[PDB]
Homo-oligomer: A and B are copies of this chain.
Amino acid sequence: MKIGIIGAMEEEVTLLRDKIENRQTISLGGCEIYTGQLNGTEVALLKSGIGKVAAALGATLLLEHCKPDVIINTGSAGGLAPTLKVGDIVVSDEARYHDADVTAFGYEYGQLPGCPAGFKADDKLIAAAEACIAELNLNAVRGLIVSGDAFINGSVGLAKIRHNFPQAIAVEMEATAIAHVCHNFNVPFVVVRAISDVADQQSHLSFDEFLAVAAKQSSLMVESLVQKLAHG
């Protein structure tokens, strides 16, 4: 089994990269992919770019070149549900674009032609992620994550998303693009995002302080999840 890992947090990628044995570096289309073994398990590691196209570009290169059996995609996101707390770990049951709209042609809002309206994470990968997260004393919340190229941090944009996706609990800029690529390659995936801030709530930590803690926690979670998916 080969596990593909795509992470948004720079420090998490560095920490994981330094743990890879027999490490090789592939440079393509402006991206760097690290391959080798993480505690004996074959892995392919990439830092995702910002925005849908950049994430899709990298995910496509990783899938085509390395052909992993599953993908673990990590990062951070803004929380949309009031009950979320900074530091919660949202685990995707599905991912949808909040800025795709061809409803004029009969498609569901957020859905693009040729794709499911929502891209579904793999049941087994979800279960494994939740077990690893809980084992690390973190709080997993399963739910819908929406992605778009417009950064959300205002009342208007926030209102639009809640109107279009009442069940969305987290928002960021790359998850759905990565899920979409995985879907086109028929590769099972799971998306995980540490919540950095919660809508309508003043955050105590600065993004930098959040990242210093979340990136380390996330790298350990990934290392545990890689092991779990390899040897149960």
A136 on the interface (CB 8 Å rule)?
no
CA distance A51 to B180 in the complex (A): 11
Alpha-carbon separation in the docked complex, A39 to B199 (Å):
58
Stretch at the interface among A126-134, A147-155, A219-227: A147-155
Does any Cβ of B come within 8 Å of A82's Cβ?
Answer: no
Select one of B54, B104, B149 contacting A99, CB under 8 A.
Answer: B149
Contact B150 A101 (CB under 8 A): yes
With a cutoff of 8 Å between Cβ atoms, the chain B residues found around residue A30 in the complex are 184-185
Q: Which of B101, B105, B153, B180 contacts A53 (CB 8 A)?
A: B180
- B51 contacts A100, CB within 8 Å? yes
Q: Is A64 in contact with B29, judged by CB distance below 8 angstroms?
A: yes
Number of interface residues of A (CB under 8 A): 39
Given contacts A28-B64, A112-B149, 15 further A-B contacts (CB under 8 A): A30-B184, A49-B114, A50-B112, A51-B100, A52-B177, A53-B53, A54-B112, A54-B184, A57-B60, A60-B60, A64-B65, A100-B149, A101-B149, A102-B151, A105-B151
A interface with B by C-beta (< 8 Å): 28-31, 49-54, 56-57, 60-61, 63-65, 97, 99-102, 104-105, 112-115, 148-151, 153, 176-177, 180-181, 184-185
